[PDB]
Design a protein around this ligand. Structure first.
Ligand SMILES: O[C@H]1CN[C@H](c2nc(-c3cnccn3)no2)C1
Ligand SMILES: O[C@H]1CN[C@H](c2nc(-c3cnccn3)no2)C1
Length: 339
């Protein structure tokens, strides 16, 4: 374990150097051709773009400054970019460039053509336990890394887990990620994945990411989430009750791990005890997992996504194509000075 301790100490040193001196202004919009919209929301979208001189493909996240302000996301967007430019781990998407202009903020990431885990899960129905375990092990290692840097992730769900050309996970969307040493208070995350202490408006901590891992493992292995209901208020009532029903096809070891991750009392939840992540890594459900081989990407993946090359968009769906407009006047300059 000294080897793991020394790995995490170096990881934190390298993170802090970039965190204290963030990169800024490393590309500009007219260096890229726009290809296709890959998803869209209330203040932002992600496009496929191509760099004009190198020919490389990238995923460009575009945030409208005025809409970020109106929806009270200023601090969250500044967190997202400052964290992404400072992290480095095999299962995190890489930020390659960032910049801003009179109207928008831009984060240019590597493009992962294999698509969302969500699409693959919904197409096949559910994953076998070994398939769900391969992905879960990558999330355990990624959360061990992030939490040792004092980062909470706060947006785990199948749509944020991309499948790469080797069949491994790349986590994207750091819009709710935050550097936290103790407690934090903001209501954020998708309803089915929220821990009880978020729903109850408490000061909460990194144990909310371990709760969300329990929801993800359940949904991968069942094909639906554990607290499912028609509207959010009914979902929240089931979460806080914490009453969970498991399919009979679940192994006994899977049920035991999920009862310990989906523990309503945060002071009793796996990942948040004296032994930290090691209660999860040493659980019987993970007995066949070679943690070093997963980190080194030496395990054969269960599934390789079908795609034709680094520009193929067939694993993403279709959205109305809107302009990328840039005002002749600067908007919200003061709010986004540090970006
Ligand atoms: O609307 C949200 C959900 N789906 C969108 C999306 N994100 C990406 C992607 C691809 N490669 C690297 C990073 N992000 N593709 O689609 C974003
Ligand atoms: O630099 C990132 C981290 N801390 C910054 C902040 N603190 C209050 N609002 O944004 C944003």
């Amino acid at each position: 374990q000294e080897s793991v301790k020394e790995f995490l100490a170096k990881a934190k040193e390298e993170f802090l150097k970039k965190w204290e001196s963030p990169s800024q202004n490393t590309a500009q919009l007219d260096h890229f051709d726009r290809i296709k919209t890959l998803g869209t929301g209330s203040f932002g979208r992600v496009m496929l773009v191509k760099h004009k001189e190198t020919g490389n493909h990238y995923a460009m996240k575009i945030l409208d400054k005025q809409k970020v302000v109106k929806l009270k996301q200023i601090e969250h967007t500044l967190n997202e970019k400052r964290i992404l430019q400072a992290v480095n781990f095999p299962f995190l998407v890489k930020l390659e460039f960032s910049f801003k202009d009179n109207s928008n903020l831009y984060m240019v990431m590597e493009y992962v053509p294999g698509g969302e885990m969500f699409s693959h899960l919904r197409r096949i129905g559910r994953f076998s336990e070994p398939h769900a375990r391969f992905y879960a092990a990558q999330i355990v290692l990624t959360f061990e890394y992030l939490h040792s840097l004092d980062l909470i992730y706060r947006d785990l769900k199948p749509e944020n887990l991309l499948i790469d050309q080797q069949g491994y996970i790349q986590v994207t969307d750091f819009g709710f990620a935050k550097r936290v040493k103790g407690r934090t208070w903001t209501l954020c995350g998708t309803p089915e994945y929220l821990a009880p202490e978020i729903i109850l408006s408490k000061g909460y901590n990194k144990a909310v990411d371990w709760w969300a891992l329990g929801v993800l493992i359940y949904e991968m292995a069942a094909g639906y989430p554990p607290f499912f209901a028609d509207q959010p208020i009914q979902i929240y009532e089931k979460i806080v009750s914490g009453k969970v029903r498991f399919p009979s096809h679940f192994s006994s070891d899977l049920k035991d791990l999920l009862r310990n991750l989906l523990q309503v009392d945060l002071t009793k939840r796996f990942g948040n005890l004296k032994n930290g992540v090691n209660d999860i890594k040493n659980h019987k459900w993970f007995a066949t997992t070679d943690w070093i081989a997963i980190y080194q990407r030496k395990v054969e993946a269960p599934f390789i996504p079908k795609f034709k090359g680094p520009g193929d968009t067939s694993n993403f769906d279709d959205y109305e194509e809107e302009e990328i407009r840039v005002s002749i006047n600067e908007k919200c300059g003061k709010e986004f000075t540090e970006f």
